[PDB]
């Protein structure tokens, strides 16, 4: 056996705690021993996680990245150690140092979303002249923030008519989106919807739109996460997320490391999981974290 150090961004949030026991149990059940490591946002105590993994004797390390360049030296430690490292969720601005990186095709989804962003909107507001709105951005240190906002935008962009009157991020935390989205509707009550880089982020935004009694203000988020299918599913004012598969990224991962602890060399660099888009009209197909 041996056993696998499962180092998370952060645990303050939903997504990331079925990801992390996703791994966990599916390394127990491989035979390992296996500890979660909650990095908790600060590439200070990841470094420090690091260091007590590699004092440790740990045999592979499943890793959730901070920062996609400053989480490298950490890697290499790790390396350096003798100790594997497999990414998961977010990769790094690197290579060699990661076996392998399993995440999901987060342009794609933003590309998805800002599709369904238009296609929702012209049909609610199909005379406007201009759809304001805002963007809530994820941890600007974490690739899939800008994939999927790169991704929305390449569609979104292409329509005049809408206009982002603010943007700014929302570190992909419900209670920050709830204050930023509070002083995005003083400074601009114009907006009729905000897409998110998340679903905490969308969270936050809700709670803050109806605080205000916003509750006309279309929102659109990225995980696929409980509360978000349950706010679309209720017929919230949440209309849409993308999908992503935490299961299926951990399970993956953990599985590469124990076939690489007895030899296994030829796993692909990166590997992108596919998202799906989750609306109104296929809410019934989706449960919290997949499919069904
Ligand atoms: O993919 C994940 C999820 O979107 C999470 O909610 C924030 O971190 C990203 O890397």
């Given amino acids: 056996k041996g056993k696998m150090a499962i180092v998370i961004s952060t645990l303050n949030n939903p997504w990331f705690v079925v990801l992390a026991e996703t791994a966990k149990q599916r390394a127990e059940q491989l035979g390992y021993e296996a500890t979660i490591f909650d990095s908790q946002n600060d590439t200070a105590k990841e470094s420090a996680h690091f260091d007590a993994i590699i004092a440790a004797g740990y045999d592979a390390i499943i890793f959730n990245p901070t920062d996609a360049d400053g989480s490298i030296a950490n890697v ?6 003798g100790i594997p490292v497999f990414c998961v969720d977010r990769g790094i601005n690197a290579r060699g140092l990661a076996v392998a990186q399993i995440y999901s095709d987060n342009y794609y989804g933003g590309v998805l979303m800002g599709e369904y962003f238009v296609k929702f909107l012209k049909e609610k507001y199909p005379d406007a002249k201009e759809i304001p709105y805002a963007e809530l951005l994820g941890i600007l240190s974490a690739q899939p923030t800008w994939d999927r906002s790169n991704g929305f935008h390449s569609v979104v962009d292409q329509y005049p008519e809408f206009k982002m009157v603010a943007q700014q991020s929302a570190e992909f935390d ?13 400074a601009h009550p114009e ?14 935004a809700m709670k803050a739109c109806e605080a205000a009694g ?14 978000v299918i349950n706010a679309i599913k209720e017929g919230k004012q949440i209309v849409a997320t993308i999908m ?9 991962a953990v599985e590469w490391a124990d076939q690489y602890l007895r030899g296994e060399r030829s796993f692909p660099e990166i590997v992108p999981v596919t998202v799906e888009l989750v609306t109104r009209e296929n809410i019934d197909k989706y449960t919290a974290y997949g499919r069904k």
Wanted: glycine share 8%; aromatic share 10%; proline share 2%.
């Fill in 76 to 81: 290499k430690r790790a390396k350096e150690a």
């Fill in 191 to 204: 907006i009729k919807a905000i897409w998110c880089g998340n679903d905490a982020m969308a969270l936050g």
């Fill in 174 to 186: 419900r209670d920050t989106a709830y204050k930023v989205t509070e002083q995005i509707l003083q």
């Fill in 214 to 227: 916003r509750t006309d203000i279309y929102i659109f988020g990225f995980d696929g996460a409980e509360d």
């Fill in 244 to 252: 992503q598969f935490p299961k299926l990224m951990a399970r993956l």
